[PDB]
From TrEMBL, chain A:
This is Beta-lactamase. Its EC number is 3.5.2.6. Residues 40-230 form the Penicillin-binding protein transpeptidase domain. It is an enzyme of class 3 (hydrolase). It comes from Pseudomonas aeruginosa. Keywords: Antibiotic resistance, Hydrolase, Signal.
UniProtKB/TrEMBL annotation, chain B:
Residues 40-241 form the Penicillin-binding protein transpeptidase domain. The modification N6-carboxylysine is found at residue 52. It catalyses: a beta-lactam + H2O = a substituted beta-amino acid. This is Beta-lactamase. The active site is at residue 49. Pfam families: Transpeptidase. Keywords: Antibiotic resistance, Hydrolase, Signal. Belongs to the class-D beta-lactamase family.
Length: 236, 247
């Protein structure tokens, strides 16, 4: 069995910046998750570039992505290079070569959100038909961490290393940002930060999302979760 | 086939700190390497904890290390450093240089398998004599900075005689710095202080993966005082910063 609890110890991190959002933090050894908002933790949002995680695994499994050091046979762009920069055309052509049938098959195997890829093969992760919750993101990342997705162990290891974003002697942070855009005041955009931390022998999975109606607030997608995980003694 | 070229453009990074040492830097591949000291670049030295890289690969390929998520449990007995007195992951044991974890891996691998893999890996003089749990710390095993680059390039390319999975597990365990522009994979080593006339050796070896290019590096220096240990990272870091590789 696994569990989730709602806490209030992190509410001060959101209200100080007037941010509507959710953080989900799961400790692997205890199979326990904590969140500031159970309803928003289960609410499905378009994934935007957090979709580069399953798209990279599917691209490698289908053979569309050549290897860790060269996406396609920029010409010498590495998989990590494509995940960091926007690389809009790169993941568009990966999705096109994968195709709707195989993309649908793998998102069902991965239990990835509502699995609705309607709206166009090269932009459905932005069309707002495909949606995934913060809880679903941490479940998906735990499966990737354990090499339990329906993909080769090698391809899961390649994507795990490509997602490293911070390294310290005591921990490794794997993460991915996403941003749908600013939307409007009545219908704001969504900004994500999802990932996990390998800290000594413990592993912490996390997923953050927030309403955003101004790119001015974009830095908060990393600063709020960073402050929570620093207060928990996980990073920093 | 491979060429080693000696330049003087990094000599001030060494003379400013009164350090006798060598830096080897290769862009893309080991086909062309640059160094401050052609003779020292190929001179073989005790690997010390840089040996944890092949030892980890061999531990995984022999099954002594069961898998990626292996935890090395602390039995509660005294260890030489307090940071080793705890359960450790493979990355944890590598990052804190937990000698006793790797001594037990070496004992379980055994002399016959250890010799076989160092021959497959072309790992320096491949001399493992003197004690299965200390040959890389105080005996006759020797490897040069150029050989370290060649070995790390093979690992980067998944060309060592080991599964691709096991090479990927060790490569992720070696990550030491991450930035949007690059990942640094690296390992330090320090044989000990020796004496003023017969100093020890300190190492920093690794590689830097950028968006479209890779750089392999190996540094070693004479050291007779622990106060000089920080130079094993500061000299090569200053060189790679001046080359626009990191920072």
């Amino acid at each position: 069995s696994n569990s989730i609890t709602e806490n209030t110890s992190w509410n001060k991190e959101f209200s100080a910046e007037a941010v509507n959002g959710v953080f989900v933090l799961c400790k692997s050894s205890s199979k326990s998750c904590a969140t500031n908002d159970l309803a928003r933790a289960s609410k499905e949002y378009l994934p935007a570039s957090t979709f580069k995680i399953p798209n990279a695994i599917i691209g490698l499994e289908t053979g569309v992505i050549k290897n860790e050091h060269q996406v396609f046979k920029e010409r010498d762009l590495t998989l990590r290079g494509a995940i960091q920069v926007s690389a809009v055309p790169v993941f568009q052509q990966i999705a096109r070569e994968v195709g709707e049938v195989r993309m649908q098959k793998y998102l069902k195997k991965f239990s990835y959100g509502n699995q609705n890829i309607s709206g166009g093969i090269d932009k459905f992760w932005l069309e707002d038909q495909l949606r995934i919750s913060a809880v679903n993101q941490v479940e998906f990342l735990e499966s990737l961490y354990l090499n339990k997705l329906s993909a080769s162990k090698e391809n899961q290891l390649i994507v795990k290393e490509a997602l490293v974003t911070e390294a310290a002697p005591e921990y490794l942070v794997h993460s991915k940002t996403g941003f749908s855009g600013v939307g409007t005041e009545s219908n704001p955009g969504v900004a994500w930060w999802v990932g996990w931390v390998e800290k000594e022998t413990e592993v912490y999975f996390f997923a953050f999302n927030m309403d955003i109606d101004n790119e001015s607030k974009l830095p908060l997608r990393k600063s709020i979760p960073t402050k929570i995980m620093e207060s928990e003694g996980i990073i920093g």
